[PDB]
């Protein structure tokens, strides 16, 4: 089943696909294990996306986040600028 | 039932100006408006030794060298704009004096924060020209 | 934790309460303390 | 571990860390607190301190003699000198150290 | 436990916290002081930093 | 400022050997072993504590 | 807003640096921090390029992109004045690049790291017992061209034509440039990712355009097909005996189109720069951060 | 507080620290004892001895 | 030079009198620490500045 991941960075986009490769470097072989790519359009490993910038000081308090049961773990990217890129597949 | 607030506090920083220490008996100084456009501060020193029986001059010079010293205090954008407006009702009132107030703590922590800099580049500049007990001991 | 951030006429005392201070509360000496740095430094609204 | 004062707050707050009883005959186990005045330091740097032995009663009587110039170590006897908190007076006849 | 035909010198170093006192003579510098300016650096988008 | 770190180095040799008339100048010491024919393997240095 | 960041220099300033800096006004320069005041470290690339005989170009563009970049204007002793470059302002970008590059008309600038020699832009600051290396800024297609003869130089290594590779060529003057024999673990990892992509390609490369491709050399001649010297290649032989479909060729295309757009971004190493209105008589163009 | 330095080390922008203190409430309690035969006659007056 | 000795006994011997200590006893040797630092010495309770 497919996944979201956010990553926060202060690199350029020519690092962030080459430094994402690296991290996915196990999960592309467990899906070449598991599935073989019998048709052409398997291979695409998926895409990233600038999301924008932020303040790389202050960057990522956590914080906690409540419904009337629970409390999951969230990050808090405070005062964020947005600007959304395409899609450049990670492969 | 209540619970009790007893009271808030806080420090009141005091400036320590730079010549309430003493440590400008090792430097005099001079209010010199426009440091930005020199680019260079030389002085000539010309020392007459004389000669003794059974003549020469040392010109030496001397240069100055130039300090820069800089912090960030920092403002969010909610006490500028509501630092602009003006307040009619009090709640609003008492919104904006907190607000100028957050601003004046900056502004205050920012020229007293350049204050604790202009000493610690003093103390850094006379540690750099010191030498040694162990060496000056003998040489003198 | 259970301190609040509400705004306050905060009474300003002489006595110089920040000997080796940031060393202390990232050791914790407090029971429950507030690090505000840089925006949030502010008076938070009523 | 985690926290130093942390460390100091729990040592001054409750300063339970399993100690003996007093006013027995033998040691048990405290479990009501705040009942005895009690402090334990070697709970809080877990080493201790060593004690005075020795081997025979030859060496100890030279330790006696001169607790300057003796011996700390003899061919296979040996013997420990006494560091502690308290230094203690050690009294054998008129002979006394410090 | 048999020694080797050649010996060794363990050099090593040592640090010490030290307490200097700092001694000068008066009026040994003269300086001259600036106008403390302030400036205006970034506009992130909640935040000014002066 | 001022609580600054001077460095200084140190040294001790190990496992040196005395020349051939070997000696003592002490009185109430006394070894097991041959006068003549010992060296050292070992040093002993002290700690901080 | 105000982006002003002064340099203090730890020592004073002979003369001739003196001379030779304030012939170096107007450069881009980069910066460790994106403060008010610096010291003399971690300016400039020689700390990652360090006075050594093997480079790595690699590296020095990761350091290029990963730091904030700068130009020099005001430049005195014991102090020189830099101005920041953010995204959202505009500049005047002066062309002292001593490799003399014709600047086209509107195209778009590129930083890179200093191929010409480590001699060529340098200033030796003695005084401050450092270097300053100050890094090259060209024209993208220059920058293209240099970087793939960089990498096809890299790739040629275990083969050997020298001249004919480590040697761009300009409507201005034909250049050299300063060739190392390994770029480290991270260059092979360049051309990892450069060999990654091609052999997905090479699964995914449609049929139908090397069916025109065999005809088209055998039909026409051109300056785009004179370099396979009338030969058909022998994967034209033994790759063109399928039969020609629509539908695969289209779901061929629906990636390849997708993959390509990562294999330029991947060459998007180092900061880019789109100007506008370069005039051949100031020397200087109105330039942004793109 | 914090200090400018020439070099540029990451500046402490202003920072604000408020810690809080809570009560260590707790309470004394003592045991007197009466016996109740010689409480009646407090209220009451003496006539006899 | 630190506080070399090429066995324990010269150790054991040096706490005990300093003044006329044994610097080259047979094989082994000690090295009185001349040191910038001069460094308490504590065993037991023979002190040694």
Same mark, same amino acid.
């Given at each position: 089943?497919?996944?979201?991941?956010?990553?926060?960075?202060?690199?350029?986009?020519?690092?962030?696909?080459?430094?994402?490769?690296?991290?996915?470097?196990?999960?592309?072989?467990?899906?070449?294990?598991?599935?073989?790519?019998?048709?052409?359009?398997?291979?695409?490993?998926?895409?990233?996306?600038?999301?924008?910038?932020?303040?790389?000081?202050?960057?990522?308090?956590?914080?906690?986040?409540?419904?009337?049961?629970?409390?999951?773990?969230?990050?808090?990217?405070?005062?964020?600028?947005?600007?959304?890129?395409?899609?450049?597949?990670?492969? | 039932?209540?619970?009790?607030?007893?009271?808030?506090?806080?420090?009141?920083?005091?400036?320590?100006?730079?010549?309430?220490?003493?440590?400008?008996?090792?430097?005099?100084?001079?209010?010199?408006?426009?440091?930005?456009?020199?680019?260079?501060?030389?002085?000539?020193?010309?020392?007459?030794?004389?000669?003794?029986?059974?003549?020469?001059?040392?010109?030496?010079?001397?240069?100055?060298?130039?300090?820069?010293?800089?912090?960030?205090?920092?403002?969010?954008?909610?006490?500028?704009?509501?630092?602009?407006?003006?307040?009619?009702?009090?709640?609003?009132?008492?919104?904006?004096?907190?607000?100028?107030?957050?601003?004046?703590?900056?502004?205050?922590?920012?020229?007293?924060?350049?204050?604790?800099?202009?000493?610690?580049?003093?103390?850094?500049?006379?540690?750099?020209?010191?030498?040694?007990?162990?060496?000056?001991?003998?040489?003198? | 934790?259970?301190?609040?951030?509400?705004?306050?006429?905060? *009474?300003?005392?002489?006595? /110089? +309460? $920040?000997?080796?201070?940031?060393?202390?509360? @990232?050791?914790? *000496?407090?029971?429950?303390? /507030? +690090? $505000?740095?840089?925006?949030?430094?502010?008076? @938070?609204?009523? | 571990?985690?926290?130093?004062?942390?460390?100091?707050?729990?040592?001054?707050?409750?300063?339970?860390?399993?100690?003996?009883?007093?006013?027995?005959?033998?040691?048990?186990?405290?479990?009501?607190?705040?009942?005895?005045?009690?402090?334990?330091?070697?709970?809080?740097?877990?080493?201790?301190?060593?004690?005075?032995?020795?081997?025979?009663?030859?060496?100890?009587?030279?330790?006696?003699?001169?607790?300057?110039?003796?011996?700390?170590?003899?061919?296979?006897?040996?013997?420990?000198?006494?560091?502690?908190?308290?230094?203690?007076?050690?009294?054998?006849?008129?002979?006394?150290?410090? | 436990?048999?020694?080797?035909?050649?010996?060794?010198?363990?050099?090593?170093?040592?640090?010490?916290?030290?307490?200097?006192?700092?001694?000068?003579?008066?009026?040994?510098?003269?300086?001259?002081?600036?106008?403390?300016?302030?400036?205006?650096?970034?506009?992130?988008?909640?935040?000014?930093?002066? | 400022?001022?609580?600054?770190?001077?460095?200084?180095?140190?040294?001790?040799?190990?496992?040196?050997?005395?020349?051939?008339?070997?000696?003592?100048?002490?009185?109430?010491?006394?070894?097991?072993?041959?006068?003549?024919?010992?060296?050292?393997?070992?040093?002993?240095?002290?700690?901080?504590? | 807003?105000?982006?002003?960041?002064?340099?203090?220099?730890?020592?004073?300033?002979?003369?001739?640096?003196?001379?030779?800096?304030?012939?170096?006004?107007?450069?881009?320069?980069?910066?460790?921090?994106?403060?008010?005041?610096?010291?003399?470290?971690?300016?400039?690339?020689?700390?990652?390029?360090?006075?050594?005989?093997?480079?790595?170009?690699?590296?020095?563009?990761?350091?290029?992109?990963?730091?904030?970049?700068?130009?020099?204007?005001?430049?005195?002793?014991?102090?020189?004045?830099?101005?920041?470059?953010?995204?959202?302002?505009?500049?005047?970008?002066?062309?002292?690049?001593?490799?003399?590059?014709?600047?086209?008309?509107?195209?778009?600038?590129?930083?890179?790291?200093?191929?010409?020699?480590?001699?060529?832009?340098?200033?030796?600051?003695?005084?401050?017992?450092?270097?300053?290396?100050?890094?090259?800024?060209?024209?993208?297609?220059?920058?293209?061209?240099?970087?793939?003869?960089?990498?096809?130089?890299?790739?040629?290594?275990?083969?050997?034509?020298?001249?004919?590779?480590?040697?761009?060529?300009?409507?201005?003057?034909?250049?050299?440039?300063?060739?190392?024999?390994?770029?480290?673990?991270?260059?092979?990892?360049?051309?990892?990712?450069?060999?990654?992509?091609?052999?997905?390609?090479?699964?995914?490369?449609?049929?139908?355009?090397?069916?025109?491709?065999?005809?088209?050399?055998?039909?026409?001649?051109?300056?785009?097909?004179?370099?396979?010297?009338?030969?058909?290649?022998?994967?034209?032989?033994?790759?063109?005996?399928?039969?020609?479909?629509?539908?695969?060729?289209?779901?061929?295309?629906?990636?390849?189109?997708?993959?390509?757009?990562?294999?330029?971004?991947?060459?998007?190493?180092?900061?880019?720069?789109?100007?506008?209105?370069?005039?051949?008589?100031?020397?200087?163009?109105?330039?942004?951060?793109? | 507080?914090?200090?400018?330095?020439?070099?540029?080390?990451?500046?402490?922008?202003?920072?604000?620290?408020?810690?809080?203190?809570?009560?260590?409430?707790?309470?004394?309690?003592?045991?007197?004892?009466?016996?109740?035969?010689?409480?009646?006659?407090?209220?009451?007056?003496?006539?006899?001895?």
């Amino acid at each position: 089943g497919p996944r979201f991941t956010f990553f926060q960075s202060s690199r350029g986009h020519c690092q962030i696909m080459n430094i994402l490769r690296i991290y996915y470097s196990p999960s592309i072989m467990h899906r070449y294990a598991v599935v073989q790519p019998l048709h052409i359009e398997e291979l695409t490993f998926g895409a990233v996306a600038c999301l924008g910038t932020f303040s790389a000081t202050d960057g990522w308090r956590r914080s906690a986040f409540n419904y009337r049961g629970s409390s999951l773990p969230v990050v808090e990217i405070d005062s964020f600028y947005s600007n959304v890129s395409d899609w450049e597949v990670i492969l | 039932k209540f619970e009790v607030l007893l009271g808030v506090y806080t420090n009141a920083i005091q400036y320590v100006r730079f010549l309430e220490t003493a440590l400008a008996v090792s430097c005099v100084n001079t209010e010199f408006k426009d440091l930005s456009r020199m680019i260079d501060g030389k002085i000539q020193f010309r020392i007459s030794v004389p000669t003794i029986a059974h003549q020469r001059t040392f010109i030496v010079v001397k240069n100055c060298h130039k300090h820069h010293i800089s912090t960030e205090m920092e403002l969010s954008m909610l006490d500028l704009e509501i630092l602009h407006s003006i307040p009619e009702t009090p709640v609003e009132y008492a919104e904006y004096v907190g607000a100028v107030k957050t601003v004046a703590s900056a502004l205050q922590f920012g020229v007293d924060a350049l204050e604790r800099g202009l000493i610690n580049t003093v103390l850094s500049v006379k540690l750099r020209h010191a030498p040694p007990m162990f060496i000056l001991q003998t040489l003198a | 934790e259970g301190v609040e951030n509400r705004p306050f006429p905060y *009474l300003t005392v002489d006595a /110089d +309460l $920040l000997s080796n201070l940031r060393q202390s509360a @990232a050791e914790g *000496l407090f029971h429950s303390f /507030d +690090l $505000l740095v840089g925006k949030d430094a502010r008076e @938070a609204g009523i | 571990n985690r926290g130093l004062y942390n460390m100091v707050n729990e040592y001054s707050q409750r300063l339970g860390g399993h100690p003996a009883t007093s006013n027995t005959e033998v040691q048990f186990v405290v479990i009501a607190g705040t009942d005895v005045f009690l402090e334990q330091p070697c709970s809080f740097l877990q080493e201790a301190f060593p004690a005075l032995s020795a081997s025979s009663r030859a060496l100890i009587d030279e330790f006696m003699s001169v607790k300057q110039t003796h011996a700390p170590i003899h061919y296979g006897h040996y013997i420990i000198e006494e560091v502690a908190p308290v230094r203690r007076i050690l009294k054998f006849g008129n002979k006394v150290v410090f | 436990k048999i020694h080797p035909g050649v010996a060794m010198t363990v050099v090593r170093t040592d640090e010490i916290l030290s307490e200097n006192i700092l001694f000068s003579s008066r009026a040994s510098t003269s300086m001259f002081i600036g106008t403390p300016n302030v400036s205006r650096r970034e506009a992130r988008v909640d935040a000014v930093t002066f | 400022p001022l609580n600054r770190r001077m460095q200084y180095s140190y040294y001790f040799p190990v496992g040196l050997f005395m020349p051939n008339p070997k000696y003592t100048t002490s009185a109430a010491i006394k070894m097991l072993d041959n006068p003549t024919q010992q060296l050292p393997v070992e040093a002993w240095i002290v700690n901080k504590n | 807003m105000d982006l002003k960041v002064v340099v203090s220099l730890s020592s004073r300033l002979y003369t001739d640096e003196i001379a030779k800096m304030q012939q170096r006004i107007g450069c881009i320069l980069p910066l460790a921090s994106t403060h008010g005041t610096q010291n003399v470290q971690g300016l400039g690339l020689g700390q990652v390029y360090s006075l050594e005989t093997v480079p790595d170009y690699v590296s020095m563009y990761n350091y290029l992109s990963d730091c904030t970049l700068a130009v020099l204007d005001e430049v005195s002793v014991d102090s020189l004045i830099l101005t920041k470059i953010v995204p959202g302002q505009t500049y005047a970008i002066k062309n002292k690049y001593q490799p003399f590059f014709q600047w086209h008309g509107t195209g778009s600038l590129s930083v890179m790291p200093p191929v010409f020699g480590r001699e060529h832009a340098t200033v030796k600051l003695e005084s401050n017992d450092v270097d300053i290396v100050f890094p090259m800024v060209l024209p993208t297609p220059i920058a293209e061209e240099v970087l793939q003869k960089i990498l096809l130089f890299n790739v040629y290594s275990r083969v050997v034509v020298h001249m004919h590779l480590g040697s761009v060529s300009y409507l201005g003057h034909h250049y050299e440039l300063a060739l190392p024999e390994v770029p480290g673990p991270l260059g092979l990892a360049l051309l990892d990712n450069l060999s990654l992509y091609f052999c997905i390609m090479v699964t995914l490369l449609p049929r139908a355009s090397m069916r025109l491709v065999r005809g088209l050399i055998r039909h026409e001649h051109h300056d785009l097909l004179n370099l396979f010297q009338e030969m058909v290649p022998d994967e034209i032989a033994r790759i063109d005996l399928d039969d020609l479909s629509v539908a695969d060729d289209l779901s061929r295309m629906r990636v390849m189109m997708t993959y390509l757009q990562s294999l330029a971004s991947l060459f998007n190493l180092g900061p880019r720069l789109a100007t506008a209105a370069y005039s051949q008589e100031t020397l200087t163009a109105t330039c942004w951060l793109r | 507080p914090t200090i400018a330095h020439g070099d540029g080390r990451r500046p402490s922008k202003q920072r604000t620290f408020i810690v809080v203190k809570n009560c260590h409430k707790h309470h004394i309690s003592t045991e007197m004892e009466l016996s109740m035969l010689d409480l009646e006659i407090l209220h009451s007056i003496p006539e006899t001895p």
